Design a protein around this ligand. Structure first.
Ligand SMILES: NS(=O)(=O)c1nc2ccccc2s1
Ligand SMILES: NS(=O)(=O)c1nc2ccccc2s1
Ligand SMILES: [Zn+2]
Length: 259
């Protein structure tokens, strides 16, 4: 069974032994070299349509916490940008560090942010998530950087529930959460073809990384760092540094939506 993690003996540098695609040609995350990324005037504005989003539950899965949505209909979708067709929101989660100087997966000119939010969407032309992840255009992941400054009001409902899902396998009801409260003002973005950043590391993602970070408070991110990787009753391992480092860009071009 799965046995990978972010510990001293099972972290990202080990994943290739069970998931050989870890050394593939389209792995994520990557460093975004802002000078080399080319403005692509053919890219469209992103269309984020979350007005009818229906959150259901929040789960500590032992590597992050996932806020899960009802994806049985087109209730919350991502379209436009670099995308063809319609991608349905299934979940969001974060990656974060032990200290504010690390935590993001993508980097910008080698800068690491304190955390990174991933909003996961699957291409409805493949019918279900499990089929979508087997396709090169199966997923669209909206990535948003977090920096530490002022509080993010729309994040507070998430932080306040974390005490109830401290350990792996715990979940809680999490209805009526509005993910629009996690977006920055601008939807300017970079995009490139990549992969899931945790096993199975499948090469099925169109990455859309927003340029503008959101600000969260130190107190908010400190609450992320009180979560545990371990299950109830087991030796406490704080859930921190659950990020994969940048991977080789290889042939790929990162495109910018903005001049
Ligand atoms: N990261 S992994 O290749 O999946 C991995 N799995 C295991 C299992 C036991 C001990 C160390 C590792 S490291
Ligand atoms: N961290 S991520 O690339 O957004 C992501 N990875 C995985 C792995 C398995 C299932 C869903 C996702 S979503
Ligand atoms: Zn992620």
């Amino acid at each position: 069974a799965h046995h990978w993690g972010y510990g001293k003996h099972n972290g990202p540098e080990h994943w290739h032994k069970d998931f050989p695609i870890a050394k593939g040609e389209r792995q994520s995350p990557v460093d975004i070299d802002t000078h080399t990324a080319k403005y692509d005037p053919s890219l469209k504005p992103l269309s984020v349509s979350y007005d009818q989003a229906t959150s259901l539950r929040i789960l500590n899965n032992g590597h992050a916490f996932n806020v899960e949505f009802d994806d049985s209909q087109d209730k919350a979708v991502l379209k436009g940008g670099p995308l063809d067709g319609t991608y349905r929101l299934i979940q969001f989660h974060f990656h974060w560090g032990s200290l504010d100087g690390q935590g993001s997966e993508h980097t910008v000119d080698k800068k690491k942010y304190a955390a990174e939010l991933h909003l996961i969407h699957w291409n409805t032309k493949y019918g279900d998530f499990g089929k979508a992840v087997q396709q090169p255009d199966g997923l669209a992941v909206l990535g948003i950087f977090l920096k530490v400054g002022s509080a993010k009001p729309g994040l507070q409902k998430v932080v306040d529930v974390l005490d109830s899902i401290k350990t792996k396998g715990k979940s809680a009801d999490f209805t009526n959460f509005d993910p629009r409260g996690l977006l920055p003002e601008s939807l300017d973005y970079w995009t490139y073809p990549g992969s899931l950043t945790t096993p199975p590391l499948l090469e099925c993602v169109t990455w859309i990384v927003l340029k503008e970070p959101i600000s969260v408070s130190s107190e908010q991110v400190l609450k992320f760092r009180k979560l545990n990787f371990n299950g109830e009753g087991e030796p406490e391992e704080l859930m921190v540094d659950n990020w994969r480092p940048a991977q080789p860009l290889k042939n790929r071009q990162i495109k910018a939506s903005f001049k």
